[PDB]
Design a protein around this ligand. Structure first.
Ligand code: A1BLX
Length: 314
């Protein structure tokens, strides 16, 4: 009976599929960092030998294939309801075989990003020379198709963020920022989902808001390319255009958030007059927090952090 225990982290094969060959290419597969919300602290599932859970997503639209496969199952002993648990966290309408999934691949040419283009950037390839092209969009639930797309996307929070939980999309104070990569296929330019960030537009009495970063997910294949830095920079630059925004902060200031934040705020602030070599040496001044707030909606306390870093650099 213990011979029917399978670790679920390694059993759940995720894929982002651009071309048919991606189905057969194990390099394209990645795996959950967390499955405890479905399978407990032990991250094991009872009842199956050779358990394979397939969640294949078409790279842009995230149209989904979901299949459970196994060598054998125990079915007066009852296997864990793997299917049922996964169905809690993914929308209906998934297909269940590779043929139907490949059919969806043909229609992917028509998939277009949701919302407003805010920024376009290039990342250099590891090999060097080739640039990949990326775009950040701001979307909301008024954009046709986005709600369904967000349901397909958010599942990933479960696999890669430890304390992850789904948001209430009917709350209009949610802002969505999406990252896409442009890629070529047979002469056409298609879009691939890279990541996203949800930002909550907290009300501040009486006429102001204070955006707070809630979640940010960069999908595993795109990690270590600087997407989070672009995403946060873009969000700061976006909300700067609104006088009614006080500042931008994070709900959950992790070590990695703080590292990312310190990177971006230094990038944004080093070329400002108030943070010049000469002005830094005179000490920290309220002027610095003022200018940082006006120019990039940087929190008063965050500007103190930037000051220390910049003053060390000098
Ligand atoms: C080799 C590892 O490469 C990367 C890892 C990450 C992770 C993983 C992920 O998907 N989410 C985030 C990450 C963080 O480190 C911190 C971030 C965070 C941002 C804002 C905020 F308000 C609160 C948290 C959440 C991002 C990137 N990236 O480039 O963005 C990696 O390259």
């Amino acid at each position: 009976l213990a011979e029917y225990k399978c670790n679920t982290n390694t059993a759940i094969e995720l894929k982002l599929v651009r071309f048919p060959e991606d189905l057969e290419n194990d390099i394209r597969t990645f795996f959950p960092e967390y499955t405890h919300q479905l399978f407990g602290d032990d991250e094991t599932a009872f009842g199956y030998k050779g358990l394979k859970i397939l969640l294949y997503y078409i790279a842009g639209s995230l149209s989904t294939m979901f299949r459970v496969e196994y060598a054998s199952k125990v079915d007066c002993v009852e296997a864990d309801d793997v299917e049922g648990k996964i169905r809690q966290i993914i929308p209906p309408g998934f297909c269940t075989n590779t043929n139907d999934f490949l059919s969806l691949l043909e229609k992917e040419v028509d998939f277009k990003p949701f919302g407003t283009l805010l920024h376009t950037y290039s990342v250099l390839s590891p090999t060097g020379g080739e640039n990949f092209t990326f775009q950040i969009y701001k979307a909301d639930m008024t954009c046709r198709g986005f709600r369904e797309y967000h349901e397909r996307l958010q599942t990933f929070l479960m696999w890669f963020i430890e304390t992850a939980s789904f948001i209430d999309v009917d709350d209009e104070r949610w802002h969505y920022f999406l990252v896409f990569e442009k890629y070529n296929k047979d002469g056409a330019t298609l879009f691939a989902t890279v990541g996203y960030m949800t930002v909550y537009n907290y009300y501040v009495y009486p006429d102001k808001t204070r955006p707070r970063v809630s979640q940010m997910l960069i999908l595993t294949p795109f990690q270590g390319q600087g997407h989070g830095a672009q995403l946060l920079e873009t969000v700061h630059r976006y909300y700067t255009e609104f006088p009614t925004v006080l500042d931008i902060t994070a709900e959950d200031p992790s070590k990695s958030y703080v590292k990312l934040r310190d990177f971006v705020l230094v990038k944004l602030c080093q070329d400002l007059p108030c943070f010049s070599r000469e002005k830094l040496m005179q000490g920290f001044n309220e002027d610095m927090a003022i200018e940082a707030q006006q120019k990039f909606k940087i929190n008063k306390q965050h500007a103190r952090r930037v000051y220390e870093i910049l003053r060390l650099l000098v």
